[PDB]
Structure 1
Amino acid sequence: LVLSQNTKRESGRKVQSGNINAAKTIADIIRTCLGPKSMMKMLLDPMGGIVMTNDGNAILREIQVQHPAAKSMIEISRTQDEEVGDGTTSVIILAGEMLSVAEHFLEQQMHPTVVISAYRKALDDMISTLKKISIPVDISDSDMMLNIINSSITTKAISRWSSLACNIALDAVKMVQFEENGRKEIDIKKYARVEKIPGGIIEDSCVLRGVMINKDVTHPRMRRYIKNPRIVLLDSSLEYKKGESQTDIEITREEDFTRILQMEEEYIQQLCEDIIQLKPDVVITEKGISDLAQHYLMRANITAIRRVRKTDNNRIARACGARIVSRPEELREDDVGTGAGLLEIKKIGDEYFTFITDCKDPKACTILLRGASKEILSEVERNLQDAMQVCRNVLLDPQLVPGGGASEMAVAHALTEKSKAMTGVEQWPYRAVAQALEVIPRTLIQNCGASTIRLLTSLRAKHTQENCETWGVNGETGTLVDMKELGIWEPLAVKLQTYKTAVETAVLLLRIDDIVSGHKK
C-alpha cells in the first residue's frame, strides 16, 4: 500500500476521451431544447415537486453527476445563466461540439496547448468580428425593445403571451434606474419582485405600480382602502423588549409591581404619540406588534402590519421612496409614505393581499403572476427572469446582433478568410472552430425538421456573399431568411459572453490529463 489507499487514478488519451464523451453527453441531452420550435422538459426533483422549464440551466441545475468535467460544465451553465439568462438554451451545446471537433485533432497527436493558442486566437477574431457586425439602437424606442423582448422570449411558452410579457417586461425594467449614481444609475433585479398567485389567467397577470404584501390587517377597524396613505416603515418591533443587559428588579413596596407594569404601557404610549405626531396613516414593521400599541394606532386611525420580510420592506421603502426607520422618537418627516397612489387590502380567495400602487415615481414594484399553477407560473417567471434580464443588459448596451446562426456564419467565413490567410499547423484548428460554429443553426433545422445539410449548405452558400450578413433561418419554416424583416434580434453582450464562456470551457477542459479520487478530507 503506497499512495492513497483506494483513490483511483487515470491518465492520458483515455482521460481526455472520457471528458469528451462526458462533454458530448452533456450537450445532446439538451440539443433539442433550443429554438422557437424547441421542446419543453419536465423534471423530477429530489423532494417530490415537479418542475417544467425549457431553460437548460435549471434542467442542468437539477442534475446530479459524478464525472467532474460534467459537473464543471454544470457550473458553467448557471454562471452565464446568472450572467445573461438565455442563450444557455445554446451555451453548453455550443461548448461540447467545439470540444467534439476539438478531440478530432488529439489523435493527430497535436498538443492541445497549441490548439488552445488558436482557440485564444479564434476568440478575439470572433469578438472583433461581432463588434463589426453589431447594431447600435436607441433605448427610448419602446416598441423595438418589445420586439427584442419578444425575440428573446420567442423560445419559451410565454410566446403566446408575448405582447403582455413584452409590456410586462418593458414597464418593469423601465421603472428601475437608481439615479443616485449620477448619469451612471443602475437597475437591480432584486427589487422587481415576482408574485405567483394561483387562479386567474395569463391575461389576468399584470404589472402593478408598487408592491404587494401577502398579509392581512392586524385589526379590523383599520381601513383596507385609502386614497393617499402616509406610511412609516418601523424596522424595530412595536412592543416592549427585554432589557438587553440581563437587568433584574427587586421591589419592596406594594404599588411598584403594578407601577412598573404601567411604565412599560407608558413606554408603549410613549412610542405611539411620536408616530401620530407626524400624521402617518400606515404602520409597518418586520417585527411583531403590541396589540396595546395596536389599540392606540386603532385609536389613531392608523393602519399597522407586522412581521414582514426585510427584502419586501426596503422595496416598500423603495416603493413610496420613504426610508425605513427603527427609531420612532427619531422618526423623520422625510420618510413619510408620500407617493402611494393607493393603499388597499384585497382578497385573492382565501388570502388578503396588500395593494400599494400608483406611486408618483415608483422605482420598485412587484409583478403579480396570475396563471394556472405555481409550477406553471414558476416556469412563467423563469421566462420573465430572463425576459427582464436581457432588457437590462440592453440598457447596458445599445448594440444588437442578428443571432439565429446568421452572425455565426458571418463569423465562420470571416475566420475562413483568416484561416487561409493564417498558414501553419494552427490553421486546421482555426478552421475547425469555424466549422464547429455551424452546428447551432443545424440544431434549429433539427428542431425545425428540415433538410439540415441542404439548408445549412444553402445557408453557408448564401453567406459566402459579402453583400448579405442578416441571412438567417426562420424557426418554423426552416428556410433561409434574412433577419432584418424576420426581426429576431439579439443583444451583443449575450452572444459575447456565449463565445466568451464557450472557449474558456475548452481550454479548461483541454488541459485535463489525469484523474484522482478519494480525497477524504
Structure 2
Amino acid sequence: KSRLMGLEALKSHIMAAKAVANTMRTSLGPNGLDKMMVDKDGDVTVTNDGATILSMMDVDHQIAKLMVELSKSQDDEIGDGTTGVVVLAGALLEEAEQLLDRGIHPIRIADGYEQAARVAIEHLDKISDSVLVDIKDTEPLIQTAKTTLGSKVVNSCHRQMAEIAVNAVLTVADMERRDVDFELIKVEGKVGGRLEDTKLIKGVIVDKDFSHPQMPKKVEDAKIAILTCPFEPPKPKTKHKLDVTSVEDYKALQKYEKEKFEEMIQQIKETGANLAICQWGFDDEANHLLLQNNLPAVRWVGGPEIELIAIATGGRIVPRFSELTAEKLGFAGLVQEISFGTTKDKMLVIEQCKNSRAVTIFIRGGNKMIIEEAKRSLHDALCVIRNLIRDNRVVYGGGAAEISCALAVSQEADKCPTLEQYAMRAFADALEVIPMALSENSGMNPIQTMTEVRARQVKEMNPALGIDCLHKGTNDMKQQHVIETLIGKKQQISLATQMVRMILKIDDIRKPGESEE
C-alpha cells in the first residue's frame, strides 16, 4: 500500500499546476510566446489561448482536466485572460505549500484564499478610473488588437483584422447611442482558402437560398427587400384550412392563390429590391413559383439573421405586403459575389457605402484549427473593446491592478487577528505571479522590475502604473497600451480562487462552515 503523506499528497496537484503554469507564464501579455502544436492528424496550429492548449494536449491528471474548465470559463464570458487565470491558480497553490510548512491546517489555508479572493475582486471596482477619452482610447485598442492577433496566432499581424476589429466597434458605437451590440460586428471564417487571404467587408455576407439548383440564380441592384409580411405562403410545419361556398368557389380559390403570387411579384417589382428576405418559411412547391418568374427570395430566415441585414442598412422592415416604400427597404452600397474558399461555393455579400452599421471581418484558412484560432484572436479583441465602449469600466492589469489588490488583502491579514491571516497574505503574494511572469519571459529582471511597482503601491493607492509588457522599460499601462476589462480581471480572480478551494478540499464529505480553531 502506497500512501502520500502531507505535502506528497498535495505535490501531485502542485506539479500538475506547475506543468501548465510553466507554459501559461510565458504566454501572458502582448509579449507572450505562442504555443505551436501538431494534432493527431498532422495538423499544425498556433495558439496563445490557454483553453486551446489545455484541450488539445492529452489530459493525464486531475488538475489538467480541471484547468480546461478554468480557462474555458474565461474566454466564454470575457475572452482574454485564459492563460492568466491558470497562472494565478497555480501561484495560489504554490504558496499553499508554504502555508502547510507553517503548520496551518490544509482547510484553514483554503478558507484564507477564498476570503482574500473576495476582497481582491471587490477592490477592483475602485482600481482604475472610469473616465476615458474616445481619441486617447482608440490608440491602445489598435495596439491591443495588433498584439492580440500578431503575437498569439498569426505571425504576420494582419493589418485588416487588427484595424477592422477596432474600427468596426467604434464606427458603429457612434451611430447607436455610444453602445455596441453583437449584431453590429461579425467575424466570418471558413476553411478552404489560405491564411494570408483577408478581405474588408463593409457590410454582411448572406448565404444564397434556393430550393433547387435548377432554378436561375438572379442578382441585381443594391436594394434589399427585408420583409416580415408573407411574401410566399407560410407553412410552419402545419396545414391550411379550406373555407369555400361551393365547388366553383374552390376552383376560384386555387386560382386566387396563383393570382396572389403574381400580385406580390408585381407589387415588389414596381418598388424595387426583388430579393425578398422573409422569416416565414414554406416548402419548395411555392418557392419555384417565385423563382420561375426570376424573383429570388430567402426563406426560413431566423430572428438575428433578418435583424442583422436590417441593422446593417439601418432601414425599416415591411410589416405588410401591401405597404411598400423606400424607407422600409435596405440601403446597400454595393452587392457583389464573394467566393467561398477557392472552389467550393459562392456567397452574396451586401456592403453599405452610406452607413457602416455592420462591419464584417472576412478571413480564410486552410485548416480548421487555424481558422478557429484566428476567430479567437478577434474574439478577445472584440470583447475587450465591446465592454470598454459600452461602459468606461476598465482595469489596467499586468502588475498595477494586481499589486493594488494584494495590498487590500494584506491589510485584512493585519486587521484580522485569526489563523487565516497568513493564508490571506499568501493570496496577496500570489497576485504578483502575473507581473512576475510578464517580466520573467522578458530579458528584464522580474524582481528588480516589480520593485518599482510595489514601491508605488505604497506611495499611492489604486495605481494605474504597472510593469511594461512591450519591453520598453517604462512602468506604465496607458503608454504601454495594456488594457483589460474591469469585469475581466474580476472573473480571473474569482475563477482562480475556485480552483484552489476545490483542490484543497482534501477528504471532507459534508460541506463545513469556516470552523474556528
Checking the alignment, whether the CA contact within 8 Å between 1:196 and 1:374 is kept in structure 2 is no
Measure how far apart 1:294 and its partner are.
0.8
Measure how far apart 1:231 and its partner are.
1.2
User: Cα deviation per residue 1:200-242 (whole Å; 9 max; x = unaligned)?
Assistant: 8869532x33211344887897753414x14145898958979
Point out where structure 2 has 5 or more consecutive residues left out of the alignment.
Answer: 242-249, 510-517
Measure how far apart 1:95 and its partner are.
0.9
Task: Report 1:319-338 matches (<5 A).
Answer: 319-320=312-313, 336-338=328-330
Checking the alignment, whether the CA contact within 8 Å between 2:278 and 2:301 is kept in structure 1 is yes
Partner of 1:255: none
Measure how far apart 1:320 and its partner are.
4.2
CA distance in 2, matches of 1:225, 1:143: 43
Partner of 1:283: 276
- Note closer, same or farther for the CA distance 1:71–1:199 as it changes in structure 2 (3 Å cut): closer
- Give the TM-score normalised by structure 2: 0.76
CA distance in 2, matches of 1:314, 1:437: 44
CA distance in 1, matches of 2:131, 2:52: 31
Choose which of 131, 140, 144 in structure 1 pairs with 2:125.
131
Question: Which SS does the other structure have where 1:404 is aligned?
Answer: coil
Choose which of 366, 369, 393 in structure 1 pairs with 2:363.
369
Checking the alignment, whether the CA contact within 8 Å between 2:469 and 2:482 is kept in structure 1 is no
Choose which of 149, 160, 167 in structure 2 pairs with 1:171.
167
Partner of 2:221: 226
Partner of 2:263: 273
Measure how far apart 1:84 and its partner are.
0.8
Measure how far apart 1:444 and its partner are.
1.5
Measure how far apart 1:402 and its partner are.
2.4
CA distance in 2, matches of 1:506, 1:196: 37
Partner of 2:204: 211
Structure 2 residue 278 is the aligned partner of structure 1 residue 294: no
Question: Which SS does the other structure have where 1:432 is aligned?
Answer: helix
CA distance in 2, matches of 1:317, 1:293: 22
Bigger mean CA deviation after superposition, 77-86 or 274-283: 274-283
User: Cα deviation per residue 1:347-405 (whole Å; 9 max; x = unaligned)?
Assistant: 57544331212176565453222578665443322110111111122134313332221
User: Cα deviation per residue 1:33-74 (whole Å; 9 max; x = unaligned)?
Assistant: 223222212334466654321111222233453544542332
Question: Which SS does the other structure have where 1:290 is aligned?
Answer: helix
Measure how far apart 1:80 and its partner are.
1.6
- Note closer, same or farther for the CA distance 1:243–1:270 as it changes in structure 2 (3 Å cut): farther
User: Cα deviation per residue 1:157-181 (whole Å; 9 max; x = unaligned)?
Assistant: 268647644541233334667999x
Question: Which SS does the other structure have where 2:466 is aligned?
Answer: strand
- Note closer, same or farther for the CA distance 1:313–1:232 as it changes in structure 2 (3 Å cut): closer
Structure 2 residue 326 is the aligned partner of structure 1 residue 339: no
- Report the AA paired with residue 30 of structure 1: M
CA distance in 2, matches of 1:369, 1:312: 20
Aligned length: 488
Partner of 2:348: 354
CA distance in 2, matches of 1:66, 1:372: 30
Structure 2 residue 471 is the aligned partner of structure 1 residue 477: yes
Task: Report 1:74-93 matches (<5 A).
Answer: 74-93=68-87
Question: Which SS does the other structure have where 2:475 is aligned?
Answer: strand
Checking the alignment, whether the CA contact within 8 Å between 1:153 and 1:159 is kept in structure 2 is no
Measure how far apart 1:268 and its partner are.
5.0
In percent, how many aligned pairs have the same letter? 32
CA distance in 1, matches of 2:55, 2:184: 24
User: Cα deviation per residue 1:438-492 (whole Å; 9 max; x = unaligned)?
Assistant: 2212212221133333433455456544389344333343735233433323332
Point out where structure 1 has 5 or more consecutive residues left out of the alignment.
Answer: 1-8, 248-258, 516-521
- Report the AA paired with residue 55 of structure 2: R
Measure how far apart 1:86 and its partner are.
0.4
Choose which of 401, 406, 414 in structure 2 pairs with 1:407.
401
Partner of 1:196: 189
Checking the alignment, whether the CA contact within 8 Å between 1:127 and 1:496 is kept in structure 2 is yes
- Give the TM-score normalised by structure 1: 0.75
- Note closer, same or farther for the CA distance 1:178–1:263 as it changes in structure 2 (3 Å cut): farther
Task: Report 1:20-59 matches (<5 A).
Answer: 20-45=14-39, 49-59=43-53
Measure how far apart 1:245 and its partner are.
6.3
Question: Which SS does the other structure have where 1:194 is aligned?
Answer: strand
Question: Which SS does the other structure have where 1:85 is aligned?
Answer: coil
Question: Over aligned residues, Cα RMSD in angstroms?
Answer: 4.5
- Report the AA paired with residue 172 of structure 1: A
Checking the alignment, whether the CA contact within 8 Å between 2:169 and 2:184 is kept in structure 1 is no
Partner of 1:436: 430
Checking the alignment, whether the CA contact within 8 Å between 1:205 and 1:371 is kept in structure 2 is no
Partner of 1:121: 115
Partner of 1:427: 421
Checking the alignment, whether the CA contact within 8 Å between 1:145 and 1:391 is kept in structure 2 is no
